[PDB]
Subunit: 335 residues, 3 copies
């Protein structure tokens, strides 16, 4: 709980209203009650701010006339919302102190104020930086290193020789460092190629739940600083992802793809390997990426939904489009 | 547990034709059935095949009965009766029995009657587990979460904090409920985390497959209606709402703030955009590319299916250049007219 | 782990050119290799670059040998020799060693010789673990399941009940074998669960990646043949049958009751519908949308690739209206036919 004046100061916002108001938490505009701070970005909500029951509303200067409550004026309400939600965050920590049921190899090196949850398993040679938090049921494999401030939720699996930077966050069920999909072929028989590269994860990386990031075959899979990766993603061996790139849920990336900085990969896209995508590329959802991308911009693929009766005709005509093409050429020749 | 055929027929509301004293030990497919097994016939083309089935009894319709070569249970709906008798004769174990000494249970957790918790499961402060709840081995249930009576988690399920799960739910292994939604503000190209302080509310009789992820809401909640069934490896983003009785097949990806109505059917591997609505009674066939809201009930589809690679090469190239084909068509129309 | 180059050459059946007494300590890429490392060359474009490689030895072909600037192992197939030498020099640790005191093992479980069970793993009643089986930390192995000799599970793998796994398999973390198939009946508008009482049978030498799910069958079994390799995030539905030596790349979804033959290659993110068969020696390229049976071997493909968004918008609009284009083409043909 925090006085509105003090909150406004920490957000570098201009206060319009009683600075003595006590703010206890953040809420959506439709759910906000007395004690809550909320925000608005869409001008459509201006007309009904009189129905919002928040104690304060983060808004722009052009919104201030429509205010029906204390208001904090800022240039970017959504970014200010991110910041105030962090000040008023209620999320608990994955663990506190070291649980007696945790199994920690005696050669593990632990920094100051490391927390390890119940039944977590820490292997030999592991290094955990200051303030690292390991959730219940996690596994951290041999000689892996987790930088200061990084946090793993429950039931995360980190394999051996993995490097994670500072202030990272990994959600439950994620697996970092499994074998890449590497095999030779000896007369129809698959021959396993041991995958003895690593994963290097930079600083301030956030990884979602049930995402898999494979280790490299010889050299490393590399995740840049500030990257965010959603749930159910697959990052194959020797993929390199540049700083501040965002990957939405269910994206599948094949081996040895290189993605630049500040990219945005829409959910359920499929990115083929041994190719590069330059900085500042957006791929919209379900994008089928087969070729390198060398110019920044927005790229898309796929034929959208239709009523089933219509789709049947659309698909049949497309599958026979070579015959249409030939008939068009014949007609041009005749005319 | 074995049961007399007459007693089984009674519990199934079926007309017994044959020896009610036969002892049934389990359910089997028609081709696999042996003595002591009960099976079922849904396809009347197998009528001439019943003499090759070695089951002790067969569920069938009244029209099938003249063709029987075994004791028969006559019902209106053999498939539904099979579902029911397989529940009566189910061999599936429970995820746990009693409370394992290796489980780690906070002193403030509130356990109802007849709760079972498997080895090395971890139960946080404030958790409430209703009567007859079963938590499998290695699960994690986070702070203040509530799981209603009769619900069951298989092994290695993760439930985060402040999650509400209804009665008689079933969650398969590897599933994660309540992780942070994909919420970040952009500050000059750097991502700023938005804490996700909403929850997940799961209704009654919900079934969730393995390695599915259901994220908590940003402020308000992600909501799963009653009777919903969700298959393996689906992604349900923050603040998605799924209406009662909707079925979501395997591998479906949903973006944030999608609302799906009641009684929908979402085919496997579909991809659904966020911040929009799908009305009641919508079916999307598999691999559907759902970009826009769906405002009318019925069946919807997308995608260009497989061809021989040599053929696909031409199809893909021609579609990619379809604007040029369109212009050539227009030009030829003008030249002819 | 270190080995004399001469001894390594013998084990690889390679012709040594250079000092057999060199001590090799590991494998590395050409770019990263240092003293004590062995590397390999598959692309003759790097011949002019070998003076920059600081490996102690390089695996190459006879045609490469005049370009060597180091000890060389000459072979017919550098890529396969690389696979074999990486196994000889593998640094990958085991998922576990010995039986962890924190493991929870039912009294009726049967263990063979030299079994290792990692910390906090849970082994149910009736489970059978063969000789040299390794179960990683945090695994669950359900009632009456059987894991054959030499098979290994990494950490946090879940095996349900009545599952059978053969010899020398390897399963990566987060994978779930034997969950309920997606089976339900309909009672006047309510879903009714169909208990899934079939099993999963996994053959010998199967490798399964991470966070893959393989559901048990409804009555009869889900079957994975010998030598099959399956990547991460795959979904194998109830009653799927996969034939020997087939490869399934990452993120593939297979619907119920699909049968896939032998020596198939299923590209990443493909979607294969059910109640149908794919014959032997079929390749489906990435993101393939498989709606019909495949009865002839060969390569099959689907999907319209990426374009710039403004171009895509026009492509998509024209395709969605292709029925009107077809009607206009037929009308024009009639006019040109003088009808
Ligand atoms: C890195 C984050 C990010 C990358 C790219 C974009 C570009 N915007 C889109 O691609 C919008 N979009 C669609 O048009 C259609 C395409 C056909 C399939 C269904 N559908 C989509 C499915 C999932 C997502 C998705 O993952 N999102 C949307 C909210 C945030 C994540 C988006 C979409 C936006 C955001
Ligand atoms: C719920 C039910 C008892 C009935 C049902 O309708 C259904 C079922 N199983 C499915 N598997 N797949 C699937 C899975 C993987 C890849 C491709 C497809 C579907 O699309 C499925 C559907 C649906 C069809 C159309 C909309 S939902 C079982
Ligand atoms: C099994 C093998 C040793 C050889 C192989 O054939 C193969 C391999 N790795 C792959 N990754 N992806 C992939 C992954 C993610 C997104 C898109 C594509 C494929 O499609 C892959 C394929 C195949 C190509 C065509 C059919 S299978 C390695
Ligand atoms: Mg997918
Ligand atoms: Mg323990």
């Amino acid at each position: 709980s925090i006085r509105l004046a003090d909150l406004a100061q920490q957000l570098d916002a201009e206060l319009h209203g009683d600075g003595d108001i006590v703010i206890t938490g953040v809420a959506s505009m439709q759910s906000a009650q007395t004690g809550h701070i909320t925000f608005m970005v869409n001008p459509k909500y201006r007309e009904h701010l009189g129905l919002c029951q928040a104690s304060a509303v983060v808004m722009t200067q052009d919104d201030l006339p429509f205010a029906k409550s204390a208001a904090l004026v800022v240039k970017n309400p959504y970014l200010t919302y991110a910041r105030m939600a962090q000040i008023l965050d209620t999320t608990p920590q994955p663990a506190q102190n070291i649980a007696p049921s945790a199994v920690i190899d005696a050669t593990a090196k632990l920094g100051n104020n490391v927390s390890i949850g119940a039944n977590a398993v820490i292997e030999s040679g592991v290094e955990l930086g200051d303030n690292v938090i390991i959730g219940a049921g996690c596994f951290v494999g041999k000689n892996s290193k987790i930088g200061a401030g990084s946090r793993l939720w429950a039931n995360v699996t980190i394999y051996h020789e993995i490097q994670i930077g500072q202030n990272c966050l990994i959600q439950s069920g994620t697996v970092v460092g499994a074998d890449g999909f590497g095999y030779a072929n000896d007369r129809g028989n698959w021959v396993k190629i041991p995958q003895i590269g690593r994963v290097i994860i930079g600083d301030r990386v956030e990884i979602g739940a049930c995402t898999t990031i494979d280790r490299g075959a010889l050299d490393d899979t590399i995740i840049g600083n500030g990257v965010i990766i959603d749930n159910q993603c697959q990052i194959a061996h020797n993929v390199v992802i540049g700083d501040n790139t965002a990957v939405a849920g269910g994206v599948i990336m094949a081996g040895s793809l290189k993605i630049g900085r500040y990219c945005m990969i829409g959910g359920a896209s499929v990115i083929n390997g041994h190719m590069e995508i330059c900085d500042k590329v957006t791929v919209t959802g379900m994008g089928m990426v087969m070729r390198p991308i060398t110019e920044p911009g927005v790229y898309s693929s796929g034929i959208p939904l239709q009523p089933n009766k219509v789709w049947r005709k659309t698909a049949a005509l497309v599958m026979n489009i070579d015959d249409m093409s030939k008939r068009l050429k014949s007609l041009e020749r005749k005319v």
